[PDB]
Amino acid sequence: QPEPDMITIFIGTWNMGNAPPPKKITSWFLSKGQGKTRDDSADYIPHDIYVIGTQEDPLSEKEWLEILKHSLQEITSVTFKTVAIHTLWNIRIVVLAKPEHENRISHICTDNVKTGIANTLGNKGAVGVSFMFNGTSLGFVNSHLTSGSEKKLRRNQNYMNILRFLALGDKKLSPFNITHRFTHLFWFGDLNYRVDLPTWEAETIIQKIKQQQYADLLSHDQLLTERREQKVFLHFEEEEITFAPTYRFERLTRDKYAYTKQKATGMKYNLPSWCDRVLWKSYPLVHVVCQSYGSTSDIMTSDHSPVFATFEAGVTSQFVSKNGPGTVDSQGQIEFLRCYATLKTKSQTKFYLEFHSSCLESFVKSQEGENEEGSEGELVVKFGETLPKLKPIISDPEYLLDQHILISIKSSDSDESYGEGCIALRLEATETQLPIYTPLTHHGELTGHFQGEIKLQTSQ
Numbered sequence: 001q002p003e004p005d006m007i008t009i010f011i012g013t014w015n016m017g018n019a020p021p022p023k024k025i026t027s028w029f030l031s032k033g034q035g036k037t038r039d040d041s042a043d044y045i046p047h048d049i050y051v052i053g054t055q056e057d058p059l060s061e062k063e064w065l066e067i068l069k070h071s072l073q074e075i076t077s078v079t080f081k082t083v084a085i086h087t088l089w090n091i092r093i094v095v096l097a098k099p100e101h102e103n104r105i106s107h108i109c110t111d112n113v114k115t116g117i118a119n120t121l122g123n124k125g126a127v128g129v130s131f132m133f134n135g136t137s138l139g140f141v142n143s144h145l146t147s148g149s150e151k152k153l154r155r156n157q158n159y160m161n162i163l164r165f166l167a168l169g170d171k172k173l174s175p176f177n178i179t180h181r182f183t184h185l186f187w188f189g190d191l192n193y194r195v196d197l198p199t200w201e202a203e204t205i206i207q208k209i210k211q212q213q214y215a216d217l218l219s220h221d222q223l224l225t226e227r228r229e230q231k232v233f234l235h236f237e238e239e240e241i242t243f244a245p246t247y248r249f250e251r252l253t254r255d256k257y258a259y260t261k262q263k264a265t266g267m268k269y270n271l272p273s274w275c276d277r278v279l280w281k282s283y284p285l286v287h288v289v290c291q292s293y294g295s296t297s298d299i300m301t302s303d304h305s306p307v308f309a310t311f312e313a314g315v316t317s318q319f320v321s322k323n324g325p326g327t328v329d330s331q332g333q334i335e336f337l338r339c340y341a342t343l344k345t346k347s348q349t350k351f352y353l354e355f356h357s358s359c360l361e362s363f364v365k366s367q368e369g370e371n372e373e374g375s376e377g378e379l380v381v382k383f384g385e386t387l388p389k390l391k392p393i394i395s396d397p398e399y400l401l402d403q404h405i406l407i408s409i410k411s412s413d414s415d416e417s418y419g420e421g422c423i424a425l426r427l428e429a430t431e432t433q434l435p436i437y438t439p440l441t442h443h444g445e446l447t448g449h450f451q452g453e454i455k456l457q458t459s460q
């Protein structure tokens, strides 16, 4: 029975509005409703993995698990295995997988972050799950960010706190946050970003939604504008939005947006908004295709409509050779020529590099590079031809070309990372000097760039 090179992953996000769900929610897991929907011909085909994120979830874990398992069983006639479930207050993530995947899935991690301080600590934050599917690392983050049209900055701060403090994936990757730990990272939830238009335009917005004319609304979506200005979700992808705003509805219909200020809203307007979102970030040159992104039309217990996204995702096998794991394959090497980091730091310390990859027995520290002044003020750290020769555990090109090298540039003085990035080994050629490049981030903010050449030797 051969190991897969592709799986399909269902991601759901629903703010349940502290109300029990209706008796039928199968439309959600089938990606039926508005937006980019799944073909009817696929309805009996199970996704490999279903990741369900809820907010304002009033159910016990047992109650929600029973509804989810019974739903998927009705759709697929498959009894899904529970990989993980984690709840912080009323924020929940559930991971369900086909039984055939039970022995492919390992290294299951769960965590949560509470966002804000005092007043603003008590109900917002994130839950997450990571695991290995054979040779591929998968992370999943369900976040409920700060609400309110005038708090996009708070939402961006909540995002940075979640990506700094959420403890998932391989702890040996100590310089790296969740935005570098996974082959594929999916980040979803009630992100709570609003359509930033004057309150007096509410009926005009509703009119535009009724005509399915979203272009002038999306141009004012705060998540898209903040992302454009590199304020949040730097280096993340999102499928084009082709479904109506998923908030705020009158309950028990989808015919009405409830936007007017009420005591129950803290006298705040809730203009129709795409609060409920799915984004992802995958390592360079790994296969990931969004196959659906939409909202349900027939689940009306909440003031939010459920959102679905489905993905084809590239996975690799758990590779064993005569040599690695447990030794090097001397027929493999990774060389770095003409390499330099460009940092935005105003500081003057010496810097060195750390190379982390599952293709190495352990991480590799470089010698300090040579600091030069860039023509526009920048710090340029030159490594030239001084970077070490990396010794992969396996030289088979069917393995090695599928791997990635995480790079941290660290201060000699503090041993603190100033920048993290990632290089694909999916090269156009072996035994050939080829350009490499990655942006460098720290706490998910742009801190610089790393560029140079690579020379990859495989057994072929």
Ligand SMILES: CN(C(=O)[C@H]1CCNC1)c1ccccc1
Pocket: 224, 227, 228, 229, 235, 236, 237, 238
């Ligand atoms: C131009 N653009 C991109 O290329 C995405 C996809 C790759 N990472 C960012 C973008 C950025 C922010 C908001 C909307 C679109």
